[PDB]
Amino acid sequence: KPQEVRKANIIAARSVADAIRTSLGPKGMDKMIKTSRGEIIISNDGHTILKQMAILHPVARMLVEVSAAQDSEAGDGTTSVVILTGALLGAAERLLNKGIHPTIIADSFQSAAKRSVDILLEMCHKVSLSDREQLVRAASTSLSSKIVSQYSSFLAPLAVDSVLKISDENSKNVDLNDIRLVKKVGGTIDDTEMIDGVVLTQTAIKSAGGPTRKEKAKKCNVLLIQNDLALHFLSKLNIMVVKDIEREEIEFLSKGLADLVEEIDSDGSKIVRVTGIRNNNARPTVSVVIRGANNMIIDETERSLHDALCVIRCLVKERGLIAGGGAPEIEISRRLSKEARSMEGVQAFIWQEFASALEVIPTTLAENAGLNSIKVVTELRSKHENGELNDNTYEEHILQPVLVSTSAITLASECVKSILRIDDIAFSR
């Protein structure tokens, strides 16, 4: 029974998707996970659940790699991509009973994913990066899910002005790993310095003889180290020394990387800033500095501003924005249901099941919010017929970038494909 071995992995995969399904949205149900080491952690983020779950099932681990690529590419939708993956697996259960080979099932997802993108771009409003008024309100709504609210008004232009300098045109993939969030003890949220040149993680020499400041530094004025007598020797030569460089920042500094080098300490920081690198090969790497008193401030702020950069990253790679809340998923299921008659053969029936699999995302959002499951879904197909993208989330300031909805369908087509293509597994060592 080669197919029955794969069906056992599909049922185990749907059980994982149903567990993450309850955690979708801010009102979703949390999951308690007790690690073998004794650490007790809980949260509604689907990326952290699957990371510490330690899944021993070979096929179920594919959701972890997709969730890792979901946060690395789009940055949002790690929970919704698991639900969409399990929806295609549930619809494929009835397909195997009809004698349909998974190759046609997997090949039809490629044509269905590419068609869903073209349909989504027709209803999407194309936006440009030259308008700074749209990017401020876009990143400000992502900060409403955190304790910081009134202080988030000054954080919106911080993330917008950093991307626009490195955006240029036709940049395609923009790596956010080059943007480092500096977490230091002391200060406040309203106090921030861009320092577009670069920002280090370490202080300077507190001993005697250290210049701590140099003008026109690279005849080596400033050096880095991954003895007390060596500091006194280079002090006469007017050479600044910075030691105790973290090993994690070695690869970081080799990418982004001086007219003026000085050490400016707001309170207690004792940090050195560099401006005007003016390198031809190297671009303008900006590291964001975050100041705060309590440890819970700079922590929750780090994850809030990181998601705001991912939303802006989606707009740079793919222009346009749509309204969140499962609004576009309803119209896509309506158009693909009528266009299913244009096909012929076994592939025509797949378009009908593919439209029903896209309605699980808006249904889960209505279930986790306390609203009636089937009643709200019926109201979506009714209102979206006359109006277009009018349901109102635009007044509620809910904006989901188009690249998240595009990558969620694209990664789900490859994830479900890699599942059904496994007909057996054996011990290999």
Binding site: K27, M29, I40, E367, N368, A369, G370
Partner: protein, 80 residues
């Protein structure tokens, strides 16, 4: 283990009323489990508590009063 951190939170600040907090949180869980047979969604139960919590503070603030009955009656006498 959640009630363990809840008991220590009241001791490090108010230091009084820790026993009453555990009893209130215990009855809320018993009545919430009975709503499962009624097909009541847990988020609505959570939303119903958050809306009622903010409105209950406003009702309590209406009956609050400072020290009174100093003339003609006695208040601080019966405390000691």
């Amino acid at each position: 283990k959640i009630l363990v951190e809840l008991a220590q939170q009241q001791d490090r600040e108010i230091g009084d009323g820790t026993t009453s907090v555990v009893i209130i949180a215990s009855e809320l869980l018993k009545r919430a489990n009975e709503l499962v047979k009624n097909k009541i969604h847990p988020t609505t139960i959570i939303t119903g508590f958050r809306v009622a919590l903010r409105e209950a503070i406003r009702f309590i603030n209406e009956v609050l009063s400072t020290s009174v009955d100093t003339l003609g009656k006695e208040t601080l006498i019966n405390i000691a």
